[PDB]
Amino acid sequence: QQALLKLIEGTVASVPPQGGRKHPNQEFINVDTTNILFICGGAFAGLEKVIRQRTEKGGIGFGASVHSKADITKLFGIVEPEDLIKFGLIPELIGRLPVIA
Amino acid sequence: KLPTPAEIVANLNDHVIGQEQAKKALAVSVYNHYKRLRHPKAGANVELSKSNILLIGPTGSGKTLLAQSLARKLDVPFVMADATTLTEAGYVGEDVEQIITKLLGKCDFDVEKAQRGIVYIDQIDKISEGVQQALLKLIEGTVASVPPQGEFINVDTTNILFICGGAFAGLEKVIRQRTEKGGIGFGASVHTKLFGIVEPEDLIKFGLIPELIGRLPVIATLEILDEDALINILTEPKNALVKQYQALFGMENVELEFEEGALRSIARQAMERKTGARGLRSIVERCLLDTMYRLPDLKGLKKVVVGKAVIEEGREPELVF
Amino acid sequence: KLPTPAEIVANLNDHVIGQEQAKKALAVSVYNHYKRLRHPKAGANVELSKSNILLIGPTGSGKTLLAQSLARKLDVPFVMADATTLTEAGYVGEDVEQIITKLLGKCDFDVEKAQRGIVYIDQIDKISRKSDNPSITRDVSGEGVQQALLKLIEGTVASVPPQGGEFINVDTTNILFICGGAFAGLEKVIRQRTEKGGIGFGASVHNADITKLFGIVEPEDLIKFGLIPELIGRLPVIATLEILDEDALINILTEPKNALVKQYQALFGMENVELEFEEGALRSIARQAMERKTGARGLRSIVERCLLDTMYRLPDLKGLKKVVVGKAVIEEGREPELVF
Amino acid sequence: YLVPTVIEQSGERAFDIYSRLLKERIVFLVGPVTDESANLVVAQLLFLESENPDKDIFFYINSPGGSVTAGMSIYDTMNFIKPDVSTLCLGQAASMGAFLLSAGEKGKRFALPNSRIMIHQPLISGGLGGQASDIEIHARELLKIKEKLNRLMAKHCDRDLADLERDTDRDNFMSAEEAKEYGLIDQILEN
Amino acid sequence: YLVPTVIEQSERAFDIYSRLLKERIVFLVGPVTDESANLVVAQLLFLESENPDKDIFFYINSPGGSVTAGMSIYDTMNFIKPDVSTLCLGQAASMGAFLLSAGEKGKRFALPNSRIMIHQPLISGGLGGQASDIEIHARELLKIKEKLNRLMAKHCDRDLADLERDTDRDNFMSAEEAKEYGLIDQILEN
């Protein structure tokens, strides 16, 4: 995630010529990823639980307010960065992915 | 032209014995694959996708032999890969398309032949994830680049047929967990038919990633070779061990012969090692080393008879002059 | 004509002591290969595979001797390669084509003889596959050499420099490959495959017996060691060398033309001192060398450390005529009996 | 008691020493035979049959006896399950302990050289209170158990029922050699 | 009691007795019962499988206990291939002294201030019921008494008549007296 932060946003990457790894003793090509569109995707399995924890907190006790208790589709449709942070994504990466489809 | 699914099995029975269900399954899938590769792949037509095969069977059942026989029949190149030769850490990508370098080298690096070839992956069950992800990304359509034959070469593996196989040892208990009443009960099922009813949830519980199961729609099962099939294997096939060693003795003036009890005993010995027809060669060579060293010295010999006592006991083959 | 296996082994005994099963295996395989080439009626459906040989065994067991004796007897284009010098084609070192070049040079570049010769490759266990690299630019010395070697062991055509300074096309379909090496991890691989043991009264409970372990090697064990499966499948004949016992070590100590005993007797022949060993001394030297687990190489260390306190004094001792090394000199911290 | 923990090499797995021995098909019957101790033996015998129905199960017995019904649950489980149940006498096999020892697979019943094996008719399988009609019923049931035990013992030992009726009348203590001659065990282990 | 936890570097957390079992040390502490003897047997069987050649160290601090329980340990010690060295800590009395003398000859040890006591067995069980039952249990106790004295005489390289005299009543011995008697081979100091 940290290595993708600078790559997703504008930077000048140093890539190998289709031949080898990313070494110090390596010939390189400069590529500007400023105008390169990135589309990240993944099946956040445990995300529905996080969204349900945030939207149905409630509480325990005689004096507490118990909140009502909507499957993967409905919960994903209301996902927020807070849930993606609790899931494991760093905020620096979510800020670089403003559109959430 | 192209061999029909019936002619494929006809020619494939000469090299492999048994496993008729897997034979017809491979024949149908391969015929359909190489008919799809003859479709008008342009215009407003339907973009056709391939159907891979998953061969589940014991060791020495003939999975690799089935794949190689199909390849020899259809003039396509073939290379066997091993999922055990792919490491978790490291560049799983860099060595997963080295198989493409191997396949290209088998066909003079002509991409036109390699892109329509066959690839067998050994020990598909021994990787029960990075290796699975790479095999999945490669089984699906992808353009890989490899070094030249001496500039880099491109290979699109969408049209390459993949036949994965392996001996799923603990799969039968995964199946029995849902097909039978109980395992440890007094009266409760204490212990290839159940391999024949294998369903995706069993392979997933075994530890195969679901996306890999999704690209292996054809599941064929191979039955263990019994003491009878291991005798035919010794005599019937085009490259039978008896035939090979009879030719070795036949370039000289000595006729090699086996007793039926010798074939049956040597087949039982191979079956006792849990390796199938793979162990037949070692025990046959052990049995015939009695004479292959002495035959150079023996003069006036005309035929050699290999009895069951040579295979079972420390007996010498009968030398009749 | 073609030397028969009995003749082959009868002359291997002149240089290699022990390892009878391997001498039989090598002799039979070589005779079958040469006869198969002389009678290519096997062009029929029977696909008699090229019976290549894999020569596994401990250090000092006699792999490099079997190769040399087989070479100098067969009277055939024979080369001895070392996988420690082999490299990938695009890097510094010797690519696998230099072996074919040496094979041509061994036959006056008459390709007809080279295409039917033998290629011995020592230390092939040193090019095994390994994980992605520390020392990472490319695993050049490893799997790349295995693949370039496999491309030669199976029927292909190599292009090599001319006889003088126009490349020669050499087909290696009929070139026999004999690979060898001391697979140091193979005993652990086998001991993981077996050695299950057990617990309880009615169960059998139990230094690694690498002799019987090597005697039960399977192709998958060599795959675990790091060899590519397609190479092992091309090496069907597997010759195993036992650890030299006391009697074989004694014979090596005394019988060969360049035995250690004769070497030191001539080393003392530069002086005028006679060196004599007792039968018990040879027995104890063989036992101590077998305990070092270095094969016949551990024999020189014993004979050198037992004579160290004597070679230091021979030029100073005047009037000395004979020195006798007894069992006490080897087993105990004693001095050989000096005869003036 | 503190049961030691041992490490099995495979990764590593930590076992208590009895679960480690169960992994190699060793089942212990130590102390009196109760409903709970007998059901643990039955649970282990059932479990080991599922792990491998062909491999022998080793039943180590160091028991002064116990409940007949509890011992019969072990006995029927031993005879029912497919794998042979080898029995070994450590220290002592008395009463139902000697019965279960003789109940092992013929040819695989063992005893250690200084073990003590004792056979005898059963005592109270339960109190005999209440009315004379209740006492008559419990006396008849005890006699049926007595005959059943002697009959099964005679079958195990290849002896006549009349021999077991004599020899189980009072506490019959036997060395390992005497039990081997009697027919309770097949071999005596030394090393 | 709280058994301390120790860390083995290789990390693996052991209780201190499992850690010592890893070093092939088996403890017999307190009375010899069916349960304490079977733990010793389980440890002896386990250690033979780990290494049939290495010595097993059997540390004994016991006032005695059941004869049959002690015999399960005794036969296990003699059966298993590895030598079982025995060491007396504090005391080895009754079956504890028997198991101490049962160690491998040359490897039976005692600490300098340990106390070793040998004696004929007491009740192996009550002697109630009828005179016929009492006769049977008396005969069985006499057979055990002779068996113990015979095995003790074998361990100590003494005559059976010597052990019959000396085990008549509680015979307390220092480590030096037990070494002279033949119960132990050496006395450890440092």
Ligand SMILES: Nc1ncnc2c1ncn2[C@@H]1O[C@H](COP(=O)(O)OP(=O)(O)OP(=O)(O)O)[C@@H](O)[C@H]1O
């Ligand atoms: N079987 C043998 N018969 C006679 N001499 C032997 C034998 N084995 C080893 N020697 C002695 O050992 C010396 C070197 O042995 P050799 O080089 O053949 O071992 P190697 O198998 O090549 O060892 P490594 O695998 O370490 O290279 C020779 O000079 C020879 O005298």
Ligand SMILES: Nc1ncnc2c1ncn2[C@@H]1O[C@H](COP(=O)(O)OP(=O)(O)O)[C@@H](O)[C@H]1O
């Ligand atoms: N059904 C079969 N018919 C003929 N030969 C067989 C058969 N199964 C195995 N073999 C022989 O066994 C050897 C190795 O078998 P292999 O292809 O490795 O089986 P698998 O791929 O199932 O492990 C081959 O040389 C082949 O001749």
Ligand SMILES: [Mg+2]
């Ligand atoms: Mg060498």
